[PDB]
Amino acid sequence: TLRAAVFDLDGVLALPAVFGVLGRTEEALALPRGLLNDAFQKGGPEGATTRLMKGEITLSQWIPLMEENCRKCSETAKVCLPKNFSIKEIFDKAISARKINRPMLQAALMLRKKGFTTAILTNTWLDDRAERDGLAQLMCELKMHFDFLIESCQVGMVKPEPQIYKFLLDTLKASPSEVVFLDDIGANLKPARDLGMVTILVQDTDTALKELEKVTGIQLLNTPAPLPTSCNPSDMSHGYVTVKPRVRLHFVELGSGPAVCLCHGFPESWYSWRYQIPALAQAGYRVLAMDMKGYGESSAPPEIEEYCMEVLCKEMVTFLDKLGLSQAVFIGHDWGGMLVWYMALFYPERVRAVASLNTPFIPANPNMSPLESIKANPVFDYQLYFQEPGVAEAELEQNLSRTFKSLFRASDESVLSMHKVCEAGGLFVNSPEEPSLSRMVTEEEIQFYVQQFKKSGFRGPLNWYRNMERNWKWACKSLGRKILIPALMVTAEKDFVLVPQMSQHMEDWIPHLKRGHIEDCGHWTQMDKPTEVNQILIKWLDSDAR
Amino acid sequence: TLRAAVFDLDGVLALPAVFGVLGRTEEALALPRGLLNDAFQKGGPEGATTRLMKGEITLSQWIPLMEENCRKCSETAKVCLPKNFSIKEIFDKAISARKINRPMLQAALMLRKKGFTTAILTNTWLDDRAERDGLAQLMCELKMHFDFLIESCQVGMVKPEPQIYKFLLDTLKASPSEVVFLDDIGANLKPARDLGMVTILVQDTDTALKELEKVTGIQLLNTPAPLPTSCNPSDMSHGYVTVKPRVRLHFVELGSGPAVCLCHGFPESWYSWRYQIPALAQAGYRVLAMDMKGYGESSAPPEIEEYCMEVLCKEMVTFLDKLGLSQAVFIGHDWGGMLVWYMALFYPERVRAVASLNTPFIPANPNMSPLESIKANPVFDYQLYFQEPGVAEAELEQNLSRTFKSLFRASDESVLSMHKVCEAGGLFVNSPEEPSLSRMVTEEEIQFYVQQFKKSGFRGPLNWYRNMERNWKWACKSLGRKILIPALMVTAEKDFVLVPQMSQHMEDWIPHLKRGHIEDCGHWTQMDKPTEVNQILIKWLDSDAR
Ligand SMILES: Nc1nonc1-c1ccccc1
Ligand SMILES: Nc1nonc1-c1ccccc1
CATH class of the missing domain: 1.10.150.240 (Putative phosphatase; domain 2)
Structure with missing residues (x-):
């Protein structure tokens, strides 16, 4: 076996x-x-x-x-x-010229996903050339996907010497019959074959994968398109910046290159960007995925005014100051998307480029109170339910697993009626107590959100919705401005609240605006369609955030 | 007043x-x-x-x-x-073309050092030009040195409007007679003068500073050369990476650009680089100042073998992997300097460039046991005293303030005899119980080290010296190699242990080696001569770590 x-x-x-x-x-x-x-x-x-x-x-x-x-x-x-x-x-x-053999890497990823221990065993060198970084980058991209990397130049042994195979087996903590060993050199296959390991001589990839599929009994060839690489929270670099005496911001950081600041929405986490963080870092960016104020490991002061857009934006400027960053690209979703448009409007010198997922940019109407404006659109009724301090906190905090499982669903999995929420008496009134797991999330991912929200609950997050009047007065000061820095608006076909149509007039205020659009995508864009999100963001960053 | x-x-x-x-x-x-x-x-x-x-x-x-x-x-x-x-x-x-007026900034720094509240009040704009980063960088470099920055475009008020002056006074929490206000525009001076503020019309800097000196009674012109900007620990971004189940590494991070990893020595801290971190970040680098394994907020496992160079180097490679960095420039001092040479020897693909302060690169002698080699040089007797587990821990942990105050001294302030340490019975035998504060450190800086060492003490740090045989066997595997990546060796004239002469044969192994040399500099290079260290490192990074 x-x-x-x-x-x-x-x-x-x-x-x-x-x-x-x-x-x-x-x-x-x-x-x-x-x-x-x-x-x-x-x-x-x-x-x-x-x-x-x-x-x-x-x-x-x-x-x-x-x-x-x-x-x-x-x-x-x-x-x-x-x-x-x-x-x-x-x-x-x-x-x-040497590049990763993507179908071979896909097969290794699939075997590991199925419980296999995987390793790279290679005859390699200590590279001190002026151009050594190219190879360091390739080795980094590859090794992250394996349990072990055994390099001849680090172990002082080479294939076909018998000792390297005994060293491999000792490392794997496996007997030879439990090992499939793949190599393109016949001479390097023999000692593994001599020990009783299953061996695959690799000439063309398809045949090698056919032999691998036949011998393991796991489908590796012709498989469905895999999801992008995700993040394991315990494997990330975690950063902490005090922006003022009682407020610290937490972020996860990965990669090198231009700073890209990811800003989640309500009621989310830095982890909502789990599929984007490895992809953007591999594309040549330094990703800073925030826990926004009120969330996760960031501070969550109880005062409503601590969450008005003016304060939130000022703190994000302080965050850049303390990190020694003159700018960052700002990418937001939902409430994070609203924050990034306001960062572009009030602090263009600190914003390298701006992108929003779902959240449109609509200038404040100085002739209508925000209370009046929200009332006009029936899909925004839930925002009225969020107004009274304590009401939505009690409902959302009663059962965390139920809250996240009810919220995080694909467009065809709705369990909630975002309609007449107040009149009904809550978001979960005619909702199951034990919702089924959405195709979008694992039980493990739900429990990460549950764990994060056990620290501060929903007061700080709900406070983002409790500054309508204050945000409106502040936004009115910017009515004579236009957003003229590089900008991207990404709409999601099936977000039934932040509908693509709401973004239709954005070019009046952002004349050079670039766009992306995702079909069959609900509100939870990053986890609904991660591959498409990654493709859109990387293309835009490479052309405009350069 | x-x-x-x-x-x-x-x-x-x-x-x-x-x-x-x-x-x-x-x-x-x-x-x-x-x-x-x-x-x-x-x-x-x-x-x-x-x-x-x-x-x-x-x-x-x-x-x-x-x-x-x-x-x-x-x-x-x-x-x-x-x-x-x-x-x-x-x-x-x-x-x-606009640049910081360095003597004006020096005067503001001096006034703040003397207890003054300082502010920048400016008529400025919201900069959305493609080239806006240049100005963002200037504003960042300047504002860090002041209590307040008041920008007309952020407050919706301009000088000479009377409301901006009342806004300034409200911000300062001061009555007008308590304020010196400096401006180059006569019209913008009058409202401040009208309120009873002391005003200085600025044409040429020297005359403006003479007026400022006369009115404040503080020497601002012709003053001694100031120290480089230091770090306030509470204002830094703090990062944490788990490199293995029981080991996490802490670092402070500042700036953008190529990653520069600073590695302190014994018995130090990330804070030993306090004068370098702001300077290198302002020079266009992303500084990662480590708490090395065994120190500060990093893990300190008790096992001696956790501190052999092979393990320490492997963990620093894992640190880069988890942060998503293919390379970093590695700069070390003392034990950190020994680590960086070994990073260059064993992982050249991950090392963009290497620099050591004081620590030379001397290949291991395969015909002499390290015990024999250390014995030959009388200045290395303290290393023999550090061998027995518990002996030096007890002496160094007895009184932390005494330990740091005795150790951190300039070349002309010695309180210790690094001679016949074992025979004498300790580092502090004929040392004062209450050493005088060195010219190099404040009481506040000493207390930061005291506070850091209260967590884990000296076991982990001393363990760096307890792997002589293991380090020698590992180093012997590298005897056929040369260091051919960009390298800098910085000697300190008055380091009486790591003497400049010990580096004399380095070109045999590092043929392209670049050098720096600091006169009247003791062992504690970074804090002894911070200005010269900064000048040497920035010059080298700009030419070779590009
Ligand atoms: N509350 C509001 N009415 O219009 N525009 C806003 C607004 C402005 C800035 C941020 C969030 C919302
Ligand atoms: N212990 C030793 N003898 O020679 N060279 C060493 C050595 C090698 C690597 C790191 C530290 C010391």
Whole structure:
């Protein structure tokens, strides 16, 4: 019974094989066949390449030794190497061209999801080249998906030496018959085969996955499109900034590059961005996913006025100040989307670019009280129910698991009537006590929200809705302005409250506005359609937040 | 009795005045005198510029209105504006050229140090230009040094309107006679003068500071060179990463740009880098100042083997992995310096560049046990005293204030004999029970270290010295390597343990090594000579960590 899968890197998890360039270079330069592959393997276990792979020397020290081997081979073959011959240039280009073998990575992800222990076992080097970051980035993207990474240069052992296989088995805490081992080099397969491991010689990926599927009894080929990588809260870097004596803001941080500040809505968490954080960080951004004021590990003062937009925006400016950031891209959803438009209006110098999911930008009407304006739209009745301090807190805090399971549903899973909420007497009046789990969330994800809301409950979050008059007076000061910094509005076809139609006049105030639109998407955009959200945001960031 | 100082921005804290370009542009383009300064002030309180300064419109909306005013003025004056005339280009260049008036900022810093409440009061705009970041950076660098920043566009009021002065006084919680108000515009001085505030018309900085010195009775001109900006722990962003089940690492984080990981020595803190963190972040780097394993808010497991260099380095690689960083520049001092050389040797792909303060790189001698090697140098006797578990812990933990005050001293303040420490029976045997405060530290700084060491004490920190044999065996695997990534070695003339001479052969192993050297500098480099450390590191980072 197999319970562990081991993959090689070159030619298996990453393609084209860096090894493959030697044959290509020979052909392109009309050199005798196998000359470069000979200089490379020269001296076998005692040679320069084995010393490199065991970590005795670095890649930069290996380059002149490989150069020396190339001549010795050329001299024997009675051929002259071309004038401008460069081993450094050949290897720089080969390493740079090598990319993750996405269907192979998908198969490894599926096996791990099914309970398999997975590992990468590779003959690799200590890379000190000026361009080493490209390879460091590839190794980082890949290794996060595996239980173990065993590199020859770190362990002082190489394949096909028998000791590295015993080392692999000791690491896996598994007997050989429990291991599938995948490799593109026949010679490197034999010792694993000799120990009784299941072995797969990898030439083309489809056949290798067919053999892997047949031997494990798990569907790996032709599978449905997987979800983007999520976040495990315990594996994240957690940051904490005091913005004023009684208020601290918590955030999760991942990646390098331009700062991207993600701002969740009601009643959410930094974790509502779980599918976006790894994707945006891998796309070359430094993601700061906030617990907004009133939520999770951030402070939750009880006063209603602590949650007016002016105060919330001022604190987000202080947050940037304390972190030493002159700007960040601000991306918001729901109440977070309203905050990001106001950050763009009041602090354009601190906003690199702005994007909202679902929340439109509608200028305040100075001739209508916000109380009057909310009353006009029947879908906003729940906002009237949220006004009286304590009423909605009591209902939302009674049973947390029920609250989150009732709220977080796809457009075809509704359990609530967002209609005549006050008259009905609550959001959950004709709602099940034990709602079924939505296709959008796991029980584990629901329990994370439950755990977060046990600290402060719903007072602070509900207070975001209790500053209508104050927010209206503040917003009226901005009526003569336009948003002229880069902006993106993302509508969700099936959000029945923040309907796409509400965004129809935004170009009057944001003339250069860019758009995205997601079909068959409800209110909970990030978790409803994470793949599409990621595609839209990454495309926009790369073109406009540059 | 004055207790508050208020400074204008344009022409006072920042020069050349953005206003000053109008006169310059007129002269350069041979336009009639004062034409551009007329189009700018056109319509007075009802005009486009006052609307901009009150925050009614943004700078990008103001540009075509100023353009319209420029023509109306030119038409009246019977002159034609040059063909390629651009208000945007003129203002972009003027804003970009404006820099902090360093002696004015120094005076404000000195007044605050002496107990004054300080503020910036400025007529400014909402900047939505594509180049707005330059100004955001300037405002960030400046505002951190003041109690208040009052911007006309945020308060909807402008100087010389009387309400902004009453608003300033309300903000300062001071009566007018308690306020010195500095401005370069005569008209903007009068309302403050009318209320009874002390006013300084600023033309040239020296005269303005002479008037300021005379009126406050505090020396501001000709003062000694100030120390670099320090860190207030409560104002920093604090980060926490779990690198393994029982181990979390704490760090302070400031700035944007390439990641720079600062690694302190024994028995220190992230706070040992307090003078470097603001300087490096302002120089365009993202600083991550660590609490090393065993210290401060980082985990401190009791096992000796948790502190061998192999384990410590592996955890720092995991730290980068969890933060989503493919590389960081690694800068170390003392034990932190030893760690950074080993990061360069074992993980060059993760090290953008490496720098050490005081700690040299000396390859392990495979023919001498580390016990034998340490014995040879009498200055390393204290390391032998640290070997026996519990002995040095008891002495160092007996009185924390005494420990830190005895250790942290400049080269001419020695209170300890680092000689025959074991034979003597401890580091503090012939040491005062109440050492005098060193010129290097405040009582407040000593108490921060005391507070940090109350959590875990000295077991984990001392364990860094208890892995000699293990570190030697690991280091021997790297003997065939060279450090070929960018490297900087900084020696300190008066470090009597890590003497500059010990670094003399480093070029044999690091051929491209760059150097720095600090005269009259003891062991505690960062706090002994912070200005020189900052100058050396910033110069090197800008040329080599690019
Ligand atoms: N309460 C309101 N009426 O109009 N616009 C608002 C508003 C303004 C800013 C933030 C949130 C809401
Ligand atoms: N303990 C030792 N002998 O030589 N070199 C070392 C060493 C190696 C790595 C880190 C710290 C010390």
